[PDB]
C-alpha cells in the first residue's frame, strides 16, 4: 500500500493518504496514528463481474465507488502531546489498537473511481504489486 505524507521527526503529522488496490483513505494523523475527521473511498470490486440490480447501471459511466466522511478517534491524553525527555495513556499498538475508536454518522455519497497505483508514487520500488481499475479488476 502506498502511504504519502509530510512527515515530522520520523512520524506522520497532518493530512496523509493511504492507497490499496480497492481502497483509498485520507485524513489527519497525529504521531503516526489516524485521528480527526477522515474520508474513506472504495469500490465494490467483488461484484464487478455479476449482473447489475438496475438496468441503467449497465450502460452508465460512473462505477460502484462509495465515499464516507468518517472520523477516527484517539484517547484524550494519548498522543496530541509531544513527549518530554505522566498521566498520559499510551498510543494504540500494532497487534491490537486498544484505545482506537471509529465513527460514521452520515450516509455515503457518490465518488469518482480509483486506480490503485496512485500516480503520485508512480515509480514502484517494491518487486510484486497488483493493479486495479473499473474496466479491469484486480489483475494480479
Amino acid at each position: 500500500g502506498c502511504l504519502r505524507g509530510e512527515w515530522k521527526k520520523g512520524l506522520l503529522v497532518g493530512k496523509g493518504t493511504y492507497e490499496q488496490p480497492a481502497l483509498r483513505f485520507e485524513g489527519e494523523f497525529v504521531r503516526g496514528m489516524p485521528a480527526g475527521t477522515a474520508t474513506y473511498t472504495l469500490t465494490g470490486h467483488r461484484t464487478l463481474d455479476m449482473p447489475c440490480f438496475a438496468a441503467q447501471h449497465i450502460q452508465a459511466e460512473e462505477g460502484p465507488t462509495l465515499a464516507l466522511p468518517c472520523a477516527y478517534g484517539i484517547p484524550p491524553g494519548s498522543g496530541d502531546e509531544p513527549q518530554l525527555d505522566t498521566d498520559k495513556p499510551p498510543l494504540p499498538a500494532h497487534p491490537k489498537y486498544e484505545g482506537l475508536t471509529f465513527t460514521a454518522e452520515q450516509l455515503p455519497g457518490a465518488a469518482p473511481d480509483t486506480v490503485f497505483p496512485p500516480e503520485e508514487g508512480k515509480p514502484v520500488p517494491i518487486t510484486a504489486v497488483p493493479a486495479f481499475s473499473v474496466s479491469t479488476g484486480l489483475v494480479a
Partner: protein, 201 residues
C-alpha cells in the same frame, strides 16, 4: 417514425441475457412493436443470408445461427435504423471494446462473429427482413400505393390466373346472383393458380 429489424443471436440467449438487452432497448427510447422467440432451420437461415451466399465466413455464420433459439424484434423510432446502428456499435467485438465501451456488442458480444446482435443496414433490407420474419406486420403504405407501382403489381398478379377465372365465369355464366359468381371465381382461383399446386388425397 420508422421501423427497423433486429435480432438477438443465440450467444446472448444461451447466457440468459435477452431480457437485459430488451430493457436496454426500451430505455433508449425504442419501442418493441413485435417480438418473437424462434429457432431457424438450415434452409431458412441460408435463405435469410442471401446477400453473402458463398463468402468466406458463410459456413460458420449459417452454422452458428442454427445452434439455438434467437429472438426477432421490430423496433420503432424516428431515427430507428441509424440510432440502432449506433446503439449496437461497431461490428467487430474487439474493435468495439477498444473504441466504444458500454455498447451491446462490447458488453454481451464476444469472439468475433458472435457479436450477440444483428441489425438492418438500409430501409430496403429492413423492410425485406421484416416481411421475411413478420409476414402479417403492416407497414410501408407509401412505397406500395404508387399508381404506377399499383398498376405494375396488378399486372404481375392478374395475367397468371384472374383473367382466366374471369373468362371462365363469362363463358359458363352461372346464376345471375353475384354471390354464386363470387364463390365460383374464388373456387377457380384457389384451384387454378401458378404459385400453389393442386392437392389430392
Amino acid at each position: 417514425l420508422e421501423k427497423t429489424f433486429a435480432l438477438i443471436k443465440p450467444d446472448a440467449v444461451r447466457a440468459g441475457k435477452a431480457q437485459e438487452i430488451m430493457q436496454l432497448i426500451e430505455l433508449n427510447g425504442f419501442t418493441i412493436i413485435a417480438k418473437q422467440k424462434l429457432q431457424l432451420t438450415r434452409a431458412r437461415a441460408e435463405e435469410f443470408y442471401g446477400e453473402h451466399k458463398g463468402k468466406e465466413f458463410f459456413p460458420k455464420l449459417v452454422n452458428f445461427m442454427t445452434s439455438g433459439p434467437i429472438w426477432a424484434l421490430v423496433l420503432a423510432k424516428p431515427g430507428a435504423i441509424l440510432a440502432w446502428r449506433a446503439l449496437m456499435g461497431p461490428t467487430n467485438v474487439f474493435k468495439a471494446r477498444a473504441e466504444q465501451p458500454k455498447c451491446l456488442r462490447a458488453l454481451y458480444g464476444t469472439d468475433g462473429t458472435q457479436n450477440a446482435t444483428h441489425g438492418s443496414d438500409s430501409p430496403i433490407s429492413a423492410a425485406r427482413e421484416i416481411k421475411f420474419f413478420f409476414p402479417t406486420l403492416s407497414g410501408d403504405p407509401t412505397i406500395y400505393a404508387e399508381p404506377t407501382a399499383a398498376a405494375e403489381y396488378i399486372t404481375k398478379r392478374i395475367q397468371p390466373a384472374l383473367a382466366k377465372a374471369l373468362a371462365a365465369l363469362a363463358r359458363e355464366k352461372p346464376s345471375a346472383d353475384k354471390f354464386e359468381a363470387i364463390t365460383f371465381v374464388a373456387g377457380y382461383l384457389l384451384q387454378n393458380n401458378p404459385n400453389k399446386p393442386k392437392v389430392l388425397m
